[PDB]
RNA sequence: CUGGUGUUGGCUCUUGGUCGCGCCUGCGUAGGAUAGGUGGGAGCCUGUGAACCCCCGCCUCCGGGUGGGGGGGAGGCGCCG
RNA sequence: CGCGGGGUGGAGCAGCCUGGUAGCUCGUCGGGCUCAUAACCCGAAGGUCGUCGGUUCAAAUCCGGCCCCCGCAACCA
């Protein structure tokens, strides 16, 4: 039919009109993660803004207190002592100056792509037309720019994520997995809600937080309470 | 031809491949009875078809006169002080004369030095279907099957 | 919206364009078509080929409307007319029957001087 | 001249533009098709009937997406390419 | 002056909105064609997407300042 038998049974333990604070949501998402693998906890929401202008288009970063649990393979396009700086801190691919010569025919997606301030004249024409809207853009507001490139890679491998606003006007980003207890999920979902409060654009009027959903990869969502 | 139905002029089998069609194409390749340098050219073409494509030249030539024959066309014919461009399938004889003549004309609008390579490179393209000669076939049928409004005057 | 398989198809064939309407059993337009609806304009509308297309187009635009069988009624003259009937048939419809209902005055209004050559 | 109200009351029908949601849709081209967009995903859809054969509601930029009933028995969809 | 819609070949205009697509049409021009021309049909010269900076690994697009046209109701000491 329209739905399933492993999906719909999850539509019995959650009332949409019953606002489950991140505690009755972090206790109920522990009974939504039924999968061969270990799911995640997709955290979504609809902000009170306008995604068509550039005064309220929220974006940035934020480290979650417990992390995620899903390892991300971060690489680099260094310049100087920032080639051995990302290789002492822990990086898969690093300072090869222009290793853009390998990735120009093929490639089966690793995870990340960082750089630095001086390789901006040609770090736009080589691999600036490929990963573009493929969310791997070395955007400095995204957190992938700077001479401190090996210092920004020990937190994206140990917790920190990225929440960007899309064309429509919402804010996504995972805050853990499905095997994370009621303490690791609920406390973490609190260090990402400040990231939407503190990064809250200026020209945005009204009650910024219209909604804040929290579900599980292949499971139903809960219109969780905003601050708690 | 106002009395008898004209009279189909009869060709003379091609001395190398047999077919009468062959010599006909040459008759067009020709200018001023220079039937030799005329004939000559046609073959030299095949020598390229042979080296450029391991396909028998004849087998190619035939298939190039085919993929070009225009199945229908437009011919003027007034009825009431108006020149409609009525379309009607074309005689299987004219259906050949056209294709042949065009393959020749086209083969002379290409930027190729020796005449040989022209008739050759062209033919090879008439078969594949992508040629300047194949072109008219298309632009002569796009004509009819467009003016198919005046069809009803099929004299 | 509503969908009914039984129908009635009208052929108003004139001189400058053949036109056809397809109604329901009560005679209410479900959809219509004409030499103008198709790409044609001007004189080549009155031509039969146009009539055919019009009929076909009318059929399909009537078919996907829940049609299956129609009652044909022609009116007028002009080339197109004929082709139009034959077109409705070999087109996928069901010509249940054809009638020739051309309007004729039992001598009423005087016609224009064009139509009055019949002095 | 005119809109709103007051004097101004009964009885059904019709139907918008908001806003309560329950719910339903999307395609230039290259491309097996009809890929709105961001985030998640290496996994789920079937014995509460899957490949397909028959029928209808619906939508149409008419290729085809969509969802229920009824034949039938175990095969689908995607990562990857 | 406050509000908001966009400048794109010679001209206009879809793309924007929903990121990476110079697409639609006529003039131009070589040619096919026909008595002649339009239509039809192939091929091509012509777009810094107003401009300037940033956001962009990529911007006609998101975009901050901005040149100018349009629309707009008010006001006018």
CA distance B82 to chain C (A): 12
H or E stretch at B121: helix B115-128
Radius of gyration of chain A (CA): 19
B152 at interface of C, judged by CB pairs closer than 8 A: yes
Q: Is the dihedral of CA A95, A101, A103, A106 positive or negative?
A: negative
Q: Which one of B149, B152, B153, B154 makes the best mutation probe of the C interface by having the most chain C beta carbons within 10 Å?
A: B149
**For B14, which DSSP code?**
B
Question: What's the CATH class of domain C1-119?
Answer: alpha beta
Residues of chain C that touch chain B, judged by Cβ-Cβ distance less than 8 Å: 40, 44, 47-50, 79
Other CB atoms within 10 Å distance of the CB of residue A150 = 25
Q: Return d(Cα A227, Cα A209) in angstroms, integer.
A: 10
Round to whole Å and give the CA distance between A159 and A72: 10
Instruction: Catalogue all structural domains in chain B, each as residue range(s) with its CATH number.
Output: 1-155 (1.10.455.10)
> Partners for C (CB, 8 Å, 3+ pairs)?
B
Measure in Å the smallest separation between the Cα of C6 and chain B Cα atoms: 32
> Chain C: residue nearest B84 by CA?
C44
- By the 8 A CB rule, do A178 and A35 touch? yes
Minimal Cα–Cα distance from B91 to chain C, Å?
23
Rounded Cα distance between A145 and A20, Å, is 38
Q: If DSSP states are collapsed to H, E and C, what string results for chain A?
A: CCCCCCCHHHHCCCCCCCCCCCCCCCCCHHHCCCCCCCCECCEECCECCCCCCCCCCCCCCECCCCCCCCCCCCCCCCCCCCCCCCCCCCCCCCCCCCHHHCCCCCCCCCCCCCCCCCCCCCCCCCCCCCCCCCCCCCCCCCCCCCCCCCCCCCCCCCCCECCCCCCCCCCCCCCCECCCCHHHHHCHHHCCCCCCCCCCCCCCCCCCECCCEECCCCCCCECCCCCC
C11: β partners? C20, C74
Q: How was this structure determined?
A: X-ray
Q: Which residues touch strand E (CB under 7 A)?
A: A 51-55, 57, 113, 115, 120, 123-142, 144-145, 167-168; B 76, 83, 85, 105, 109, 135-136, 139, 142-143, 146
Task: Yes or no: say if C72 and C99 are a contact pair by the CB < 8 Å rule.
Answer: yes
Contacts of C79 in chain B (CB under 8 A): 152
Residue A211 and residue A45: Cα distance in Å, rounded? Answer: 5
Q: Please answer yes or no on whether B149 and C50 come within 8 Å at the CB atom.
A: yes
Q: Which two tokens stand for residue C15?
A: 């001189």
Contact call for A and B: 3+ CB–CB distances under 8 Å: no
Residues 6+ away with beta carbon under 8 Å from C63: C92, C93
Our CA dihedral for A137, A141, A146, A148, rounded to 10 degrees, sits at -110
B148 touches chain C (CB under 8 A): yes
Spatial separation of the C-alpha atoms in residues A80 and B87, rounded to whole Å: 77
Minimal CA–CA distance to B99: which of B74, B128, B63? B63
Is residue B120 within 8 Å of residue B44, measured between CB atoms? yes
Chain C interface includes B150 (CB < 8 A)? yes
Q: Which of A89, A101, A161, A96 is nearest to A126 (CA)?
A: A101
């Amino acid at each position: 039919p329209k739905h399933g038998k492993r999906y719909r049974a999850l539509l019995e333990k959650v009332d949409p009109n019953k606002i489950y604070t991140i505690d009755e949501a972090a206790h109920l998402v522990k009974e939504l993660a039924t999968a061969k693998f270990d799911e995640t906890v997709e955290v979504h929401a609809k902000l009170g803004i306008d995604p068509r202008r550039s005064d309220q288009n929220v974006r940035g970063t934020v480290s979650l207190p417990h992390g995620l649990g899903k390892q991300v393979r971060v690489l680099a396009i260094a310049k100087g002592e920032k080639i051995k700086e990302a290789e002492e801190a822990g990086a898969d691919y690093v300072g090869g100056e222009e290793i853009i010569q390998k990735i120009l025919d093929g490639w089966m997606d690793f995870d990340a792509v960082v750089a630095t301030p001086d390789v901006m004249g040609a770090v736009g024409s080589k691999m600036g037309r490929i990963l573009g809207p493929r969310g791997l853009l070395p955007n400095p507001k995204a957190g992938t720019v700077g001479f401190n490139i090996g210092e920004i890679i020990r937190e994206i491998k140990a917790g920190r994520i990225e929440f960007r606003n899309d064309k429509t006007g919402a804010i996504h980003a995972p805050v853990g997995k499905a095997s994370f207890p009621p303490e690791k999920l609920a406390d973490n979902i609190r260090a990402f809600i400040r990231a939407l409060e503190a990064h809250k654009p200026e020209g945005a009027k009204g009650t910024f937080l219209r909604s804040v959903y929290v579900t599980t990869t292949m499971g139903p969502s809960v219109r969780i309470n905003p601050h708690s | 031809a106002r009395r008898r139905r004209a009279e189909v002029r009869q060709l003379q089998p091609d001395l190398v491949y047999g077919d009468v069609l062959v010599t006909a194409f040459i008759n067009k390749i020709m200018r001023d009875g220079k039937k030799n340098l005329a004939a000559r050219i046609f073959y030299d073409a095949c020598k390229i078809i042979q080296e450029k494509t391991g396909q028998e030249p004849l087998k190619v030539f035939k298939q190039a006169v085919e993929n070009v024959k225009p199945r229908m066309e437009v011919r003027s014919r007034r009825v009431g002080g108006a020149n409609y461009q009525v379309p009607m399938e074309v005689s299987p004889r004219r259906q050949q004369s056209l294709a042949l003549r065009w393959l020749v004309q086209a083969a002379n609008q290409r930027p190729e030095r020796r005449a040989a390579v022209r008739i050759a490179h062209e033919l090879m393209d008439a078969a594949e279907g992508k040629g300047g000669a194949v072109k008219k076939k298309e632009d002569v049928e796009r004509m009819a099957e467009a003016n198919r409004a005046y069809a009803h005057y099929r004299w | 919206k509503r969908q009914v398989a039984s129908g009635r198809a009208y052929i108003h064939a004139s001189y400058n364009n053949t036109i056809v309407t397809i109604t329901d059993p009560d005679g209410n337009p479900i959809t219509w078509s004409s030499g103008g609806v198709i790409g044609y304009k001007g004189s080549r509308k009155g031509t039969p080929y146009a009539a055919q297309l019009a009929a076909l187009d009318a059929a399909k635009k009537a078919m996907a409307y829940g049609m299956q069988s129609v009652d044909v009624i022609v009116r007028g003259t002009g080339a197109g007319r004929e082709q139009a009937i034959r077109a409705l048939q070999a087109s996928g419809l069901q010509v249940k029957s054809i009638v020739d209902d051309t309007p004729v005055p039992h001598n009423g209004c005087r016609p224009k001087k064009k139509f009055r050559k019949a002095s």
